[PDB]
Amino acid sequence: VAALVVDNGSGMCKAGFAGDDAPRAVFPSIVGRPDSYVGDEAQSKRGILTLKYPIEHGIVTNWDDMEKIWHHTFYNELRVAPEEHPVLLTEAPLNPKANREKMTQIMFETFNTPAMYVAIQAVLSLYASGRTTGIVLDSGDGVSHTVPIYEGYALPHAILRLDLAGRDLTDYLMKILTERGYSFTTTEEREIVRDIKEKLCYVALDFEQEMATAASSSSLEKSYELKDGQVITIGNERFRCPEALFQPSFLGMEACGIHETTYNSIMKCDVDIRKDLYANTVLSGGTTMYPGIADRMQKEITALAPSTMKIKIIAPPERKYSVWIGGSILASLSTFQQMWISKQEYDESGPSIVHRKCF
């Protein structure tokens, strides 16, 4: 039998089979109520429902809705049953101890999982790349984390959190396009701006130079065609949008960009591990998909790192799903088989066994 890999995020859930190379199910983390819908179905009926997001900045804030998402995951999405399979769940870096315990309780007692495991999302992305030691920048829909990992251990003292991700960038693009002329008022219009962001936007190597280029010619402009046929044109907004990742000031934030956040995390580690981290900086999450982010991150960290240092930014071509894939690799390993938590082991110990088994 094969295990299941469930990767829950702030915006999207990824579900499938340990052994597979891609999640079979990908759907929004939305629970809708006026009796209860989950995912794709709920986004359509938004007109007659109040929509809830159980996962805020990677952290589960509502447990009743999280149960409903997980239920829809097996029965509706994967068309399987939880008590037949081991389940690999993913957690956010620096996830509260109680959340981890509640996550373990819900699986065993509510779904009767014969086995389960909870792994840190960034640690899995590092595994997916084929590394066990390195630093992961995970930028999703709700949160950006810089996570230094030593031989499978995420180093809690060195993890940094920044509440600036895809959702914030989608909202920023709406705003700067609004300033340029267009009006985006409906949620069906936001889902367009989000698509514009995912299709055309890119990270400039030199922002100020790129701004000068956009002001002198139309060479950087792209045309996005709408469903009704009408075409919209985007200039410097293409790179001004993901620039907010490097200058949170663009959003009115008093925070370091993803580059200096990565640097600051490496500098919180033991001096003798940094030279491996600088050369094993892996990018993961949907918000790291912008063309030219790897080269920009490379450029910016080079300015902060020692001049003798080898800087290497790994941007796996698929990295939008490296968390799930890293789990699909982990749960499929014959060497990992004895690191699950059996239902027996839970019944004997209780929820708090998660800490002594999952690290």
Binding site: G19, T132, G152, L333, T335
Partner: peptide, 20 residues
């Protein structure tokens, strides 16, 4: 080599993944 040492060695070795 501990059970964990052999887990990290398998991750670094990599592995083949299934199809659809």
């Amino acid at each position: 080599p501990s059970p964990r040492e052999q887990l990290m060695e398998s991750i670094r070795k990599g592995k083949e993944l299934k199809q659809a």
